[PDB]
Write a protein that binds this ligand. Structure first.
Ligand code: ADP
Ligand code: CA
Ligand code: CA
Ligand code: K
Ligand code: K
Ligand code: MG
Lengths: 352, 123
């Protein structure tokens, strides 16, 4: 019996079948309910945003609206996969540092609302490390709603050393929307935010040295690149292409006092005892859509090398498919001949 | 804990090699020990008998330059599961084709060698 693999993202759900090398269903983690009264999920809800109120049930990777989350899972099983959840094992992912009470609520819903026969809950960052072929490393997982640095030793996350950033892709989308007002663009609506998100993914990159890139981008127009809006107008973006993702390293750009992602990775490694830090520094694994910027790995290598003791050998790993590395790790794990020994069955749960 | 190959793991001093094949751990014919398919990933358990009479365990997972992502992911995961089954007492080592530790090289008197090919991906 083939397990179903569901990665519950703040921004997008990734869903598919164990044994596939990529999720067959990717859709926005959005629930729309009538403005004047039924629920619509994902892409359906975005096309009917005029008659619906749109909500995000997963905030910063944590489920915070359980009624709407159940609509998302129902949509995943019935409208995306067309699978009977009561007839498949299910691997669900959870954020690092997800409270045990949240896990238990998700377990209760899977077993008592969807009647799943067996399930396993996996930590997202751990699945990404496995998908990179590693048992030890530090995973930098940056999604739409949350970023985490997760040290992992010999297969197990070190909870005391995990660090969490509210800074992720949605903040960078909003920051691009903001700084584009310097050129006269006024993107503000929810639908225009989607367009800006796409502008961000197509045109942004991470500077190797921000100050030097400001200088070279000022000296000519080579920085400028174009993007065709859906109405056919062409937009031109200049140094916004690298100033937007620069917030990952300088959250003060966003009005945040938080440490940037290089500092956070360094602090996370320092929480682990000295004897395993070299294995972490040599296995910094990038995960998630917001790590997809061109230039991230070379820039991260520079900045962590500056911070870390010079005896440490810094190695930043940027897997090409890292956008879905969580889901792929879940696909591998739940295909293994030993998966049936790791899961919790409905009969066990119902009699606990 | 119920996988047949887990039940055989680490009972006696010696060298045990499994290859990842279609999301399973499959024992490598002993005649082929030392020769690794570059298209594949393997798990290697070295068991040593101490003066104590207790056993020390070293788990290496070896990744070929052309092995597929299901094979290297499964090799990592199986390595963790075998360690757990061994009560957490194995030391885990990641071995990349052409950059293997001298400990791992030292397990094979004829040296490490590589072959073209491999078993098909599970993906
Ligand atoms: N090529 C890209 N460059 C930069 N950001 C990207 C790229 N692709 C996706 N993203 C961003 O990654 C975020 C979604 O990543 P994901 O890891 O799926 O998040 P989640 O798991 O929280 O839903 C979004 O903000 C999206 O815009
Ligand atoms: Ca192979
Ligand atoms: Ca161990
Ligand atoms: K994330
Ligand atoms: K340094
Ligand atoms: Mg995610």
């Amino acid at each position: 019996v083939q397990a179903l693999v569901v990665d519950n993202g703040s921004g997008n759900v990734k869903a598919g079948v164990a044994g596939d090398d990529a999720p067959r269903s990717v859709f926005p983690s959005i629930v729309g309910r009538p403005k004047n009264p039924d629920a619509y999920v994902g892409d359906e809800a975005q096309t009917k945003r005029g008659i619906l109120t749109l909500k995000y049930p997963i905030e910063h990777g944590i489920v915070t609206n359980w009624d709407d989350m159940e609509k998302i899972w129902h949509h995943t099983f019935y409208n995306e996969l067309r699978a009977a959840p009561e007839e498949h094992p299910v691997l669900l992912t959870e954020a690092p540092l997800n409270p045990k009470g949240n896990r238990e609520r998700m377990t209760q819903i899977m077993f008592e609302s969807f009647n799943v026969p067996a399930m396993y809950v996996a930590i997202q960052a751990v699945l990404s490390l496995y998908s990179s072929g590693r048992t030890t490393g530090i995973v930098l997982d940056s999604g739409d709603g949350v970023s985490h640095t997760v040290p992992i030793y010999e297969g197990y996350a070190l909870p005391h050393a995990i660090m969490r950033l509210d800074l992720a892709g949605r903040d960078l989308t909003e920051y691009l929307m903001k700084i584009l007002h310097e050129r006269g663009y006024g993107f503000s609506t929810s639908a225009e935010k989607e367009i800006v998100r796409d502008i961000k993914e197509k045109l942004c990159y991470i500077a190797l040295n921000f100050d030097e890139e400001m200088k070279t981008s000022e000296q000519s127009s080579d920085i400028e690149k174009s993007y065709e809006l859906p109405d056919g107008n062409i937009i031109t973006v200049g140094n916004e292409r690298f100033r937007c993702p620069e917030a990952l390293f300088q959250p003060s750009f966003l009005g945040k006092e938080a440490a940037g992602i290089h500092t956070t990775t360094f602090n996370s490694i320092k929480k682990c005892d000295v004897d395993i830090r070299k294995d972490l520094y040599g296995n910094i694994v990038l995960s998630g859509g917001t790590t997809m910027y061109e230039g991230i790995g070379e820039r991260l290598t520079r900045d962590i090398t500056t911070l870390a003791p010079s005896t440490m050998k810094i190695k930043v790993v940027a897997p090409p498919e890292r956008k879905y590395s969580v889901w792929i790790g879940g696909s591998i794990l739940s295909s293994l001949s030993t998966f049936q020994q790791m899961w919790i069955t409905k009969e066990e749960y119902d009699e606990s | 804990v119920e996988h047949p190959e887990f039940l055989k793991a680490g009972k006696e001093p010696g060298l045990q090699i499994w290859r990842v094949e279609k999301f399973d751990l499959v024992p490598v014919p002993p005649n082929l020990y030392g020769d690794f398919f570059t298209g594949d990933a393997y798990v290697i358990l070295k068991t040593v008998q101490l003066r104590n009479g207790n056993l020390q365990y070293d788990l290496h997972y070896w990744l070929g330059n052309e092995c597929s992502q299901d094979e290297s992911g499964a090799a990592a995961i199986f390595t963790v599961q075998l360690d757990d089954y061994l009560n957490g007492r194995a030391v885990q080592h990641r071995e990349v084709q052409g950059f293997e530790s001298s400990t791992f090289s030292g397990y094979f008197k004829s040296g490490l060698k590589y072959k073209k090919g491999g078993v098909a991906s599970g993906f």
